[PDB]
Write an enzyme that holds these catalytic residues in place. Structure first.
Site, mmCIF file in Angstrom:
data_model
loop_
_atom_site.group_PDB
_atom_site.id
_atom_site.type_symbol
_atom_site.label_atom_id
_atom_site.label_comp_id
_atom_site.label_asym_id
_atom_site.label_seq_id
_atom_site.Cartn_x
_atom_site.Cartn_y
_atom_site.Cartn_z
ATOM 1 N N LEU I 41 0.841 -1.186 0.000
ATOM 2 C CA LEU I 41 0.000 0.000 0.000
ATOM 3 C C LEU I 41 0.884 1.247 0.000
ATOM 4 C CD1 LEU I 41 -2.552 -1.349 2.614
ATOM 5 C CD2 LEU I 41 -2.796 -1.367 0.133
ATOM 6 N N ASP I 42 0.276 2.422 0.143
ATOM 7 C CA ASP I 42 1.023 3.673 0.174
ATOM 8 C C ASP I 42 0.400 4.590 1.222
ATOM 9 O OD1 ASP I 42 -1.241 3.903 -1.525
ATOM 10 O OD2 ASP I 42 -0.432 5.767 -2.349
ATOM 11 N N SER I 43 0.854 5.846 1.233
ATOM 12 C CA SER I 43 0.470 6.778 2.289
ATOM 13 C C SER I 43 -1.030 7.045 2.279
ATOM 14 C CB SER I 43 1.245 8.085 2.130
ATOM 15 O OG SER I 43 2.487 7.875 1.487
ATOM 16 N N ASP I 45 -3.399 5.117 1.108
ATOM 17 C CA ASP I 45 -4.081 3.916 1.575
ATOM 18 C C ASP I 45 -4.015 3.801 3.091
ATOM 19 O OD1 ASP I 45 -4.653 3.382 -1.028
ATOM 20 O OD2 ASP I 45 -3.188 1.766 -1.263
#
Ligand SMILES: CCCCCCCCCCCCCCCCCC(=O)OC[C@H](COP(=O)([O-])OCC(O)COP(=O)([O-])OC[C@@H](COC(=O)CCCCCCCCCCCCCCCCC)OC(=O)CCCCCCCCCCCCCCCCC)OC(=O)CCCCCCCCCCCCCCCCC
Ligand SMILES: CCCCCCCCCCCCCCCCCC(=O)OC[C@H](COP(=O)([O-])OCC[N+](C)(C)C)OC(=O)CCCCCCCCCCCCCCCCC
Ligand SMILES: CCCCCCCC/C=C\CCCCCCCC(=O)OC[C@H](COP(=O)(O)OCCN)OC(=O)CCCCCCC/C=C\CCCCCCCC
Ligand SMILES: CCCCCCCCCCCCCCCCCC(=O)OC[C@H](COP(=O)(O)OCCN)OC(=O)CCCCCCCCCCCCCCCCC
Ligand SMILES: *P(=O)(O)OCC(C)(C)[C@H](O)C(=O)NCCC(=O)NCCSC(=O)CCCCCCCCCCCCC
Lengths: 174, 67, 125, 128, 274, 104, 178, 55, 87, 459, 63
Positions: I41-43, I45
């Site tokens: 995932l990322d920031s 998310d």
């Protein structure tokens, strides 16, 4: 009742209409009044009868103090301290009596207004006039004497009022 | 009565509260209909409103203009 | 609300009646013989009944009768329908009399306007 | 584009709308680090004294003492009579007095004139 | 002056109410609007109608506040209609009680609020009143219907928006009995009190048919308009708020300016000058 | 202090102050129970203009409604005994000016 | 509230906080769940569109424009959790929080009313008194000569030690004391 | 609530003051009821003394 | 009033939410899997996950603390510590 | 009056011959006995005053003040025994002797039948007060406070002595009865204007008047608890009593010379309430509240109507009791934390419940909450001022609003909120402190029950 | 039993005390308790004097 003078504290004769029911339904107010008489009025009446019976065994009296009239500030000589003191005390007592007279008239006015209820404007004209006269006289006598009022100051105010009246009458007759 | 909590599900109800809510709603609507049946003049009025344009000069006391 | 407000404000206030000055014409102006209104309840009767001074109009006798009927049949607070209707009917008649007075004032005002206009035209001619 | 927001005295400018927050010089970062260091030193001192088991009393706050001293005792020694101070003092300490004196004197003069002319409703005015 | 103050109060408070998201705030502004209506009633020289409305409003407004408190307690101290929802079937008894209270508040033709509000509106229309005050009273009645619609629509209709852990339980005998006692009054007390009191004023027997229906017409109009506007929220269409919406939601900016400027100046003068 | 950060672990959470940091000269005026200077969704000038305009419009329209009132197409109400002369407190000795109401 | 703040917020932190705040206010505007999901997906699409940007100056400019747009378009009455600072239930229980130093001033009879609790309290007090010197020594060993440059605190580097400055963190009043 | 007894006492005191206000026949007693309901409102609004908004 | 929370209940609810997330495969999801390193995932998310947990539990996690919750176990520990859950 | 004066002059040898550990017990018990004995003076006449002898007399105005002094002495003893535990026995006896001398001088002041003897005694009240302040005050500012207090009062009072001796030379007697029965109008002239100025300015400085009040914050803040209690409860009432007594001979010049003093009193009442709104010190807040209340009393006396004198007397008694209670509460909180900053200690509602209740009752009585005698006096003064003019209602309403604001601000700041985290030496309230608060508050409510006892001769 | 013990004390004792206070102390001074005079309608019977307040005149009845 005999506790107070009916002439000093007037009260019109009460006119309670006779009940004329028009329904076969019972009267809850009548039933509740009967219950109140059976549960409260009789016990308090018995208690008061016992208390009054106790009071009657040790009956004793108290009196109303009487004051004889003394020469007033008009009769008092200038810087006569004893006569001045007597006159000042008499004036103060008369001032208190006049205050209580005004209070009596005001109480009569209030009671008549409440009694007459919805038609107080017309039926209480008699008591409003008496209060108007009493208040006017009381104000003229003790209106603006001040915090340090005295019989000398009230006498000076009356002298000023009399001088004004005499001047007005002389001008009218001129 | 002990009501168990639910997770993401419709809560547990009681027949008593269901029937009480239904009874009181039905009571309100019955009262409204019953009142509107008997004294309907409280909503629709009772006395006709006169049309002043239909009143005659005879009954209003207006003399002829020429006179 | 009403059309009379529109006529008086967006129009001829001279031809529309003044509520505060009404009536501006003699009561018998246009009525050859006019009868004074009849008052049934007396001053003493109204005072004894202690009707509010707002309620001591010409429909006071029906109000007194309604109050007496209501007091006598206390637990049954639904037994005064006839008296209530009589009082309301008398009030309705009083209100329509007031409406007739307003209409009479309006048409008398416009009749006076027409008469003065005709007199002005006669003077001009 | 969208209407601008005008900051006021009693409705200040939000931090997210401050132009200074989007123009960050390397000096600004050093200043922020210094401010954080000062705050951290003060916090460390307070936390040590606060978590000391043997302490029984109030942790004296020199900042609070300075505030209460400046608000109360350090005002007069730093007061110099200037035109601004003189005008403000004269106004705020004299003008209301004369204004209220004028108002009450005019009111009482009108009352006395009415009393002398004998056309003032003084009926039922018993208590004074 | 009393009539004008009451008119402006009821209009302003209803206008602020129709767009609040806190249920307690909505009920408070409804109370303020009803107080303004009572002050209007006093201003037209109808003191007894004011007292009758005091009694009726006490009944149904107390019940409405109790229902709101029950909702708040069930949803774990949640006072946001944006988070309420589904309570029509989640909580039957409080739902029906709140519906009855709202109908009584808006002037249901034969409930407790009918025997006071309808007479008040008729007296306002039929008297020598201020035209602007009369218009503001009618608009305030419509907005009363509007915010009652808002409360019902955002609290009971639709899908749930509360947190998933359902702790809803309104089966307490204390709550049920208290709401029952204040619920019978919200239906029948108006009729009893109206029929038992002696006539304190002359009734308005004669009046135009449209002027008789003025309260009902504006109530229904407010209901329909508010319902349509609230139904428009379901659309997948997002638009920025308007100036009128900002004015109404933020209480007319009165608390902001009048609570920040005068207080600041007074407190600054207290220390700087005195 | 309302503008100050709520989530920070202040030494005085209610006052939102730390130990030893300088205290504003007007802290007694800027507490959370006192004057608030936090930003608003609407500009202060816009809020002032809107509030003043609304209140001025209401006052002007109230005056206009006062000079253009609303009534009903009826004449004055009629009361029996000289517009209730004695019941409203007239002088019984003095004779009032008679007031007569006729039928229509 | 449990994390020591840094001297500044990075660009990523700023944009993430803006993202969360914009989503919250959009949810305040879009009351219904499906509408909120739709518009939140659109918002994340916008953020993804601007996600890759080599020019940090342009990224800061876009952030400033987005902040201005948010301030114009914010909900005047946003949703706030009841326990959150703007919530209706914020700080309601602060009057019920009473500390253990108040606790130890009790009368002997009041203490005797709860015999077992005060034994464990005395054990806790002995643990506190037997560790303060180690805690302060550890604090003064690790800090730089200039002084602490952040509010962070070290853990216990040894087996028999406790993390320094722990007493009030551990013994803070419960969230619902009474 | 830890102080539900005090809450009920405050509610009863407000009821007493309101009854005094309603049944008061003279202005001084009416003012007594006036200020009594005012101060009871002050005491009950800030029921949670730890809440700055309540204060 | 409300039933008290437990560590098991908190863990079950956070895993429930994360398994209802559509960017996480429930089969390769465990209480120790990291959002960035081993979930992909990322920031943004992570921000959405934190907002989902806030909605789930009815309380707000501050942004300064939310950035560091990089693991379901970390979220469980943070929520339990804030809510005073010890069993 | 000897049946009250002699027991105090016997309290002195009792204090100086008691054992070291029984001084407080003996002094408190016998002070309470003397107060009970002095309660007999409340049986006043409806026509004239109680003339005991050629030297001492009692009136419906003197009796409540004497009872207040006799009741206030044991409370001062309790507070002093609280804060003087470490002093030596000789210094404790000296402090008790100072309190006894102050009470004796106050009793003789309120009972003196001649203006010159009244002047001598009401000037003699300075020496014990100055010694107490400048010797047992805690801060460095006690010396400056004592200097300010002494010199303000004396600069006010010396022209009063000159005026009194001149009046004696002109008229032949300073006896109050003689100057009341033989009073003559005061003609409008510069000489009479300056005589009026001398007398009124002395008593205004004693009141204190706005613009002549700085000594009051200085002394009240820096004095010990007993000194603060006696300064506000009784010593402030010397000015009002003197003005009520001296204005007999100043008419009709008072009708024209009262304008500057009335304007000063009203506007300074507003200003001191506003100052109370923004005070960082609790004792200063209470002192400025005292200034506002005494300014209201000044307004009542200057307008000089029978309705104003009654309100003035009631307000004096009520303010004395309320100010003593507030000073005691502030002193208890000071003894807890050894600092007078108002925001230093918070959460005292959740740290000390019954003390919070005492704070609430004291704050409720400070603002005019009916039917308290505070409200009775304030309402009488407001009505008399309304009769005087119809904008005094505006000024009084503003003052009442600010009074409620600052009273509840003090209550909320001191009690509500969350407690200070690092302040952990707030022990449970002592039985002595709670008894002191109860003895402060209960007589106030009993006087509310029976209001005519404190309405003065004009009733 | 609890309802009965509560009712006798809290209702019975105060009503006894209040009735005793009103009947024998309050209604012993003039004008302390003043009842508004009862409304008298035409065609009624005044109880004190056995009086007959007469009916009103005929109404000009409408329909
Ligand atoms: C200085 C001025 C002083 C004025 C003094 C007098 C003021 C009187 C005000 C009266 C009330 C006005 C209407 C409500 C205003 C607030 C609206 C609002 O906030 O809505 C959001 C709010 C919901 O907000 P939300 O759910 O939180 O979501 C946010 C929105 O999505 C957010 O969406 P949005 O922002 O797009 O929504 C707002 C938008 C859309 O909403 C509406 O239009 C709502 C109102 C619709 C109905 C009202 C118009 C029609 C009424 C009569 C219809 C029938 C007539 C008769 C026909 C038959 C005749 C025989 O509103 C407008 O555009 C303005 C409409 C109102 C104008 C008021 C007068 C002028 C104000 C100043 C000038 C500027 C105006 C333009 C705006 C600013 C510049 C851009 O709406 C409601 O809750 C419902 C509101 C309406 C319900 C009641 C409707 C009936 C009652 C009012 C009319 C009177 C009927 C009876 C008359 C009897 C006569 C005898
Ligand atoms: C170098 C700068 C110095 C600045 C000094 C400023 C001092 C200000 C405070 C003191 C004066 C307050 C004046 C208020 C305004 C109203 C004046 C007024 O009513 O005048 C008319 C009044 C009344 O006059 P009148 O105008 O009503 O008279 C008309 C009536 N007939 C027709 C019968 C004559 O004048 C006086 O009272 C004159 C005597 C005043 C004597 C001096 C005492 C005044 C008060 C002193 C207070 C000292 C402490 C405070 C200051 C420190
Ligand atoms: C400027 C305001 C006043 C400044 C006060 C400075 C203090 C010393 C001033 C010296 C006195 C000033 C003149 C006072 C007037 C005076 O002395 O005589 C007053 C009058 C005249 O007497 P006769 O000789 O009989 O007149 C002839 C009749 N055929 O006699 C009296 O009334 C005696 C009263 C003594 C008052 C003297 C002082 C009073 C004035 C001060 C105001 C009040 C004090 C204020 C305190 C502040 C101190 C600055
Ligand atoms: C809604 C309430 C009822 C409104 C009724 C409007 C009536 C028409 C009107 O207001 O006309 C404007 C009027 C000028 O008419 P006029 O009577 O000649 O006034 C001259 C002043 N000497 O001008 C005035 O009376 C001045 C105020 C006009 C306000 C109009 C509305 C805005
Ligand atoms: P993770 O660490 O992967 O996060 C990725 C980030 C964002 C940190 C990137 O690495 C990054 O920094 N990229 C470059 C900087 C950047 O993305 N700048 C632009 C982002 S802000 C932006 O584009 C916002 C525009 C749309 C949203 C605006 C909000 C306004 C609407 C709110 C209305 C109020 C009510 C709805």
């Amino acid at each position: 009742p005999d506790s107070w003078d009916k002439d000093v504290y007037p009260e019109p004769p009460r006119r309670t209409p006779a009940p004329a029911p028009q329904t076969s339904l019972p009267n809850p107010v009548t039933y509740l009044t009967k219950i109140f008489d059976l549960l409260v009025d009789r016990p308090v009446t018995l208690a008061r009868e016992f208390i009054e019976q106790q009071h009657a065994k040790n009956r004793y009296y108290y009196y109303h103090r009487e004051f004889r009239r003394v020469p007033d500030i008009t009769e008092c000589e200038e810087k006569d301290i004893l006569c001045m003191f007597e006159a000042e005390m008499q004036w103060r007592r008369d001032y208190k009596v006049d205050q209580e007279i005004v209070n009596i008239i005001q109480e009569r006015l209030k009671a008549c207004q409440q009694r007459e209820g919805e038609s107080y404007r017309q039926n209480c004209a008699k008591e409003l006039e008496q209060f108007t006269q009493v208040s006017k006289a009381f104000q003229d006598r003790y209106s603006d004497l001040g915090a340090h009022y005295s019989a000398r100051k009230c006498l000076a105010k009356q002298k000023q009022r009399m001088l004004a009246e005499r001047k007005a009458a002389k001008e009218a007759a001129a | 009565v002990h009501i168990e909590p639910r997770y993401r599900q419709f809560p547990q109800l009681t027949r008593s509260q269901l029937i009480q809510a239904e009874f009181f709603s039905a009571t309100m609507w019955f009262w409204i209909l019953w009142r509107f049946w008997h004294d309907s003049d409280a909503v629709l009025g009772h006395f006709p409103y006169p049309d002043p344009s239909q009143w005659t000069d005879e009954e209003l006391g207006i003399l002829p203009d020429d006179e | 609300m009403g059309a009379h407000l529109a006529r008086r404000y967006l129009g001829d206030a001279s031809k529309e009646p003044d509520p505060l000055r009404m009536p501006t014409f003699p009561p018998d102006y246009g009525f050859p013989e006019r009868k004074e209104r009849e008052m049934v309840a007396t001053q003493q009767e109204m005072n004894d009944a202690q009707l509010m001074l707002q309620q001591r109009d010409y429909c006071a006798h029906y109000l007194i009768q309604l109050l007496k009927c209501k007091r006598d049949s206390f637990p049954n607070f639904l037994a005064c329908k006839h008296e209530q209707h009589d009082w309301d009917y008398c009030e309705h008649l009083d209100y329509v009399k007031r409406m007739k007075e307003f209409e009479r004032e309006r048409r008398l005002l416009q009749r006076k306007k027409r008469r003065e206009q005709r007199e002005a035209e006669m003077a001009r001619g | 584009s969208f209407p601008k927001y005008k900051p006021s005295r009693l409705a200040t400018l939000p931090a997210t709308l401050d132009p200074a927050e989007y123009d960050i010089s390397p000096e600004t970062r050093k200043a922020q680090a210094e401010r954080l260091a000062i705050r951290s030193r003060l916090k460390r001192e307070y936390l040590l004294q606060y978590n000391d088991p043997n302490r029984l009393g109030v942790i004296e706050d020199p900042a609070l003492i300075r505030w209460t001293y400046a608000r109360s005792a350090n005002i007069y020694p730093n007061f110099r009579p200037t035109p601004k101070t003189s005008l403000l003092g004269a106004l705020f300490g004299i003008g209301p007095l004369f204004f209220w004196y004028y108002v009450f004197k005019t009111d009482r003069d009108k009352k006395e004139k009415l009393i002398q002319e004998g056309k003032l409703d003084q009926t039922f005015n018993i208590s004074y | 002056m009393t009539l004008c103050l009451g008119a402006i109060t009821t209009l302003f408070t209803a206008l602020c109410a129709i767009t609040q998201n806190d249920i307690k705030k909505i009920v408070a502004f409804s109370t303020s609007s009803q107080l303004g209506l009572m002050m209007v009633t006093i201003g037209i020289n109808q003191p007894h109608l004011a007292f009758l409305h005091i009694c009726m409003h006490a009944f149904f407004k107390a019940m409405l506040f109790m229902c709101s408190g029950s909702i708040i307690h069930s949803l774990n101290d949640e006072q946001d209609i944006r988070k309420m929802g589904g309570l029509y079937k989640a909580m039957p008894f409080t739902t029906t009680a709140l519906i009855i209270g709202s109908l009584a508040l808006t002037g249901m033709p034969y409930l407790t609020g009918f025997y006071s509000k309808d007479l008040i509106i008729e007296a306002v229309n039929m008297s020598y009143t201020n035209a602007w005050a009369l218009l503001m009273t009618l608009i305030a009645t419509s907005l009363t219907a509007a915010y009652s619609t808002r409360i019902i629509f955002f609290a009971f209709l639709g899908k749930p928006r509360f947190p998933p852990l359902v702790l809803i339980n309104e089966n307490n005998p204390l709550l049920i009995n208290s709401i029952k006692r204040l619920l019978i009054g919200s239906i029948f007390a108006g009729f009893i009190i109206s029929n038992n009191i002696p006539p304190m004023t002359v009734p308005n027997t004669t009046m135009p048919l449209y002027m008789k229906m003025t309260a009902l017409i504006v109530t229904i109009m407010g209901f329909m308009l508010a319902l349509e506007l609230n139904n428009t929220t379901y659309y997948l269409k997002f638009k920025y708020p308007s100036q009128t919406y900002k004015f109404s939601n933020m209480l007319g900016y009165y608390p902001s300016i009048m609570h920040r400027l005068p207080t600041y100046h007074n407190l600054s003068m207290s220390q700087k000058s005195a | 202090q309302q503008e100050r950060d709520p989530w920070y672990d202040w030494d005085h959470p209610d006052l939102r102050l730390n130990w030893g940091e300088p205290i504003h000269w007007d802290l007694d005026m800027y507490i959370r129970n006192r004057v608030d200077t936090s930003p608003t969704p609407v500009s202060w000038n816009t809020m002032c203009k809107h509030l003043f305009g609304f209140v001025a419009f209401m006052l002007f329209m109230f005056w206009v409604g006062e000079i253009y009132p609303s009534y009903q197409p009826v004449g004055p109400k009629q009361y029996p005994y000289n517009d209730l002369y004695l019941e409203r407190g007239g002088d019984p000795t003095k004779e009032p000016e008679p007031v007569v109401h006729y039928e229509i | 509230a449990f994390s020591a703040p840094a001297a500044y917020l990075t660009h990523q932190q700023k944009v993430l906080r803006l993202y969360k705040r914009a989503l919250r206010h959009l949810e305040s505007w879009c009351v219904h769940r499906d509408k909120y999901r739709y518009f939140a997906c659109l918002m994340r699409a916008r953020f993804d569109e601007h996600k890759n940007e080599k020019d940090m100056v342009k990224a800061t400019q876009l952030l400033r424009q987005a902040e201005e747009e948010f301030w114009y378009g914010q909900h005047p009455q946003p949703y706030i959790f009841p326990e959150s600072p703007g919530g209706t239930s914020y700080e309601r229980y602060e009057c019920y929080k009473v500390p253990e130093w108040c606790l130890d001033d009790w009368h002997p009879s009041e203490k005797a009313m709860y015999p077992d609790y005060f034994a464990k309290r005395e054990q806790w007090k002995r643990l506190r008194r037997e560790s303060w010197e180690r805690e302060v020594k550890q604090l003064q060993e690790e800090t730089p000569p200039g002084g602490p440059r952040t509010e962070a605190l070290p853990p216990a580097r040894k087996e028999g030690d406790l993390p320094p400055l722990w007493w009030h963190i551990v013994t803070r009043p419960r969230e619902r004391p009474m | 609530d830890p102080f539900i007894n005090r809450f009920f006492k405050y509610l009863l005191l407000f009821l007493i003051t309101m009854m005094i206000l309603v049944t008061a026949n003279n202005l001084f007693q009416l003012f007594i009821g006036w200020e009594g309901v005012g101060i009871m409102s002050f005491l009950l609004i800030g029921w949670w003394h730890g809440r700055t908004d309540a204060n | 009033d409300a039933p008290p929370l437990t560590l098991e209940a908190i863990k079950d609810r956070v895993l429930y939410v994360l398994k209802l997330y559509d960017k996480i495969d429930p089969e390769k999801l465990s209480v120790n899997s990291h959002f960035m390193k081993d979930l992909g995932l990322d920031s943004l998310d992570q921000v959405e996950i934190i907002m989902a947990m806030e909605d789930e539990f009815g309380f707000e996690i501050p942004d300064i603390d939310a950035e560091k919750l990089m693991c379901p176990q970390e979220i469980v520990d943070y929520i339990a510590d804030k809510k005073d859950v010890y069993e | 009056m000897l049946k009250i004066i002699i027991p105090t002059t016997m309290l002195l040898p009792m204090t100086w011959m008691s054992k070291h550990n029984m001084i407080w017990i003996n002094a408190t018990v016998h002070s309470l006995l003397i107060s009970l004995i002095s309660l007999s003076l409340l049986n006043q006449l409806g026509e004239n005053s109680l003339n005991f002898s050629l030297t001492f007399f009692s009136d419906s105005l003197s009796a409540p003040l004497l009872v207040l002094t006799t009741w206030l002495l044991p409370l001062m003893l309790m507070a002093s025994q609280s804060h003087l535990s470490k002093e030596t026995t000789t210094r404790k006896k000296l402090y008790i002797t100072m309190l006894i001398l102050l009470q004796l001088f106050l009793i003789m002041t309120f009972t003196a039948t001649e203006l010159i003897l009244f002047y001598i005694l009401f000037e003699a009240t300075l020496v014990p007060t100055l010694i107490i302040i400048t010797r047992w005050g805690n801060q460095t500012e006690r010396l400056n406070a004592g200097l300010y207090f002494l010199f303000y009062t004396l600069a006010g009072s010396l022209p009063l002595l000159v005026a009194l001796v001149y009046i004696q030379n002109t008229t032949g007697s300073l006896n109050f009865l003689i100057i009341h029965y033989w009073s003559h109008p005061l003609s409008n002239s510069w000489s009479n204007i300056f005589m009026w100025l001398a007398c009124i300015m002395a008593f205004m400085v004693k009141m204190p008047l706005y613009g002549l009040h700085l000594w009051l914050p200085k002394a009240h803040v820096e004095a010990p608890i007993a000194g603060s209690m006696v300064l506000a409860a009784v010593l402030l009432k010397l000015g009002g009593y003197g003005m009520m007594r001296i204005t007999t001979i100043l008419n009709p010049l008072t009708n024209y010379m009262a304008y500057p003093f009335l304007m000063l009193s009203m506007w300074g009442m507003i200003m001191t309430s506003s100052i109370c709104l923004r005070q960082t010190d609790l004792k200063s807040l209470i002192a400025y509240s005292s200034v506002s209340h005494m300014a209201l009393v000044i307004v009542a006396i200057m307008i000089q109507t029978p309705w104003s004198f009654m309100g003035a007397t009631a307000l004096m008694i009520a303010h004395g009791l309320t100010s003593s209670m507030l000073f005691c509460l502030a002193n208890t909180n000071y003894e807890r934390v050894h600092s007078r900053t108002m925001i230093l200690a918070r959460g005292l509602q959740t740290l000390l419940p019954l003390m919070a209740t005492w704070w609430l009752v004291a704050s409720l009585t400070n603002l005019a909450l009916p039917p308290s005698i505070n409200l009775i006096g304030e309402l009488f003064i407001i009505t008399a001022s309304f009769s005087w003019s119809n904008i005094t209602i505006i000024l009084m309403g503003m003052n009442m609003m600010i009074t409620a604001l600052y009273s509840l601000y003090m209550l909320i700041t001191t009690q509500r909120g969350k407690y200070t985290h690092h302040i952990n030496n707030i022990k449970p309230s002592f039985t002595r402190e709670n008894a002191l608060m109860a003895l402060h508050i209960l007589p106030l409510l009993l006087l509310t029950l029976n209001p005519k006892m404190i309405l003065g001769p004009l009733y | 039993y609890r309802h009965s013990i509560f009712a006798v004390t809290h209702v019975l004792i105060p009503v006894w005390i209040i009735h005793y206070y009103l009947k024998y102390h309050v209604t012993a001074k003039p004008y302390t308790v003043v009842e508004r005079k009862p409304r008298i309608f035409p065609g009624d019977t005044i109880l004190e004097t056995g009086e007959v307040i007469p009916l009103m005149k005929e109404f000009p009845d409408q329909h």
